[PDB]
Amino acid sequence: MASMEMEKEFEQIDKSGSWAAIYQDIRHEASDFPCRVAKLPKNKNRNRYRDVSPFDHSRIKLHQEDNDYINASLIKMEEAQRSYILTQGPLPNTCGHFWEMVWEQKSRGVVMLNRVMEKGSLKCAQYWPQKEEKEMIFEDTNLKLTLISEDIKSYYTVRQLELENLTTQETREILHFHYTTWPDFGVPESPASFLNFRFKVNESGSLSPEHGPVVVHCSAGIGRSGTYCLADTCLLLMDKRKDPSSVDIKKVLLEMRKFRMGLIQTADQLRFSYLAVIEGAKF
Ligand SMILES: [Cl-]
Ligand SMILES: [Cl-]
Ligand SMILES: [Cl-]
């Protein structure tokens, strides 16, 4: 019943053509916090986009002795009982930092929402190994990463990776959930594949409470990644709440934007998030 209620509002926004107005209201209401660390001169080459930075209060800090900076934010959705690390696609010089973050934060799942190249432009470095016999060694952070197997499906691929801390020789299995079919322009026409992908992430065990937060990225870590986090958080809230129809997607998005700027980068992404929540509410 909460799906039919939200669907009638959705149809009202469609008929009004008010998606852009609602979206601009969100942009205007969104939190503004300092990002002084991200903007230090020494961090210039650690940011893929000069206009997308983590706030100081929620940034993930690396623990090794150097420079603690990575373009990544901890989004703690307390009522939904889930935290997420949203991060940019790693750069050629930050793939060691990325896996150091995964190790130190105890994450067991990585959700990737882009292809490495799209429309003939690079969105992310090739930060995992494509071939079993060609493992990756990150000499700066002393980590080794091996492809163990992969399950390639028509719309997404799940890879079983082994991440080894070369200092301690401890190994962990990391699952790489790679949504490979987001369209080159716009958003998916239907959220069915997106929701089936989310189900596979949530059923994998990689997001058990015993493990650290899932790491989610796209190219900047705000648009497609914001859509995934927003839909997942809203659907979780529909279980936490006594009345599932009380979940207000705009309010949830504003709460997420306390922890990372720019989440949801277009009105079409906002509409898609509503559509995904409406459909997932049925199930
Ligand atoms: Cl500096
Ligand atoms: Cl709410
Ligand atoms: Cl924005």
Cα–Cα–Cα angle for 259, 263, 268, nearest 5°? 160
Helix residue spans in the chain (DSSP H): 2-16, 19-29, 95-105, 192-203, 224-240, 249-256, 267-282
The ligand whose atoms approach the alpha carbon of 39 most closely is: 1
Three-state DSSP class for residue 126: coil
Whether the Cβ atoms of residue 251 and residue 79 lie closer than 8 Å to each other: no
Residues annotated in the binding site, as ranges?
A: 184, 218-224, 265
Among candidate residues 95, 124, 218, 229, the one labeled active-site is 218
What backbone torsions phi and psi does residue 22 show, to the nearest 5 degrees?
A: -60, -45
Which are the contacts of 259, defined by CB distance < 8 A and separation ≥ 6? Answer: 55, 58, 73, 74, 75, 76
Experimental method of this PDB entry: X-ray
The Cα 126–Cα 134 span in angstroms is 13
By residue count, the chain amounts to 283
Tokens of 17: 């053509």
Number of domains in the chain: 1
Tell me the residues surrounding ligand 3 (ion) with CB < 5 Å: 27, 262
Nearest Cα residue to 98 out of 35, 48, 167:
48
Ligand nearest to the CA of 252: 2
How many whole angstroms separate alpha carbon 92 and alpha carbon 112?
Answer: 16
CA of 98 to the centre of ligand 1 (A): 20
Instruction: Verify whether residue 218 is a known catalytic residue.
Output: yes
Give 185-194's long-range contacts (Cβ < 8 A, gap of 24+): 186/268, 187/227, 187/266, 187/268, 187/269, 187/271, 187/272, 188/272, 191/231, 191/272, 191/275, 191/276, 191/279, 191/280, 192/279, 193/155, 193/156, 194/228, 194/231, 194/276
Instruction: Report d(CA 38, CA 43) in Å as an integer.
Output: 6
> By residue range, what is the domain housing residue 204?
1-283
Distance CA 216, CA 228 (A): 8
| Resolution in Å, one decimal place | 1.5
- In three-state secondary structure terms, 205 is coil
Identify whether the C-beta of residue 43 lies closer than 8 Å to the C-beta of residue 67.
yes
Q: How far is CA 214 from the centre of its chain?
A: 8
Strands 109-112 and 171-179: parallel
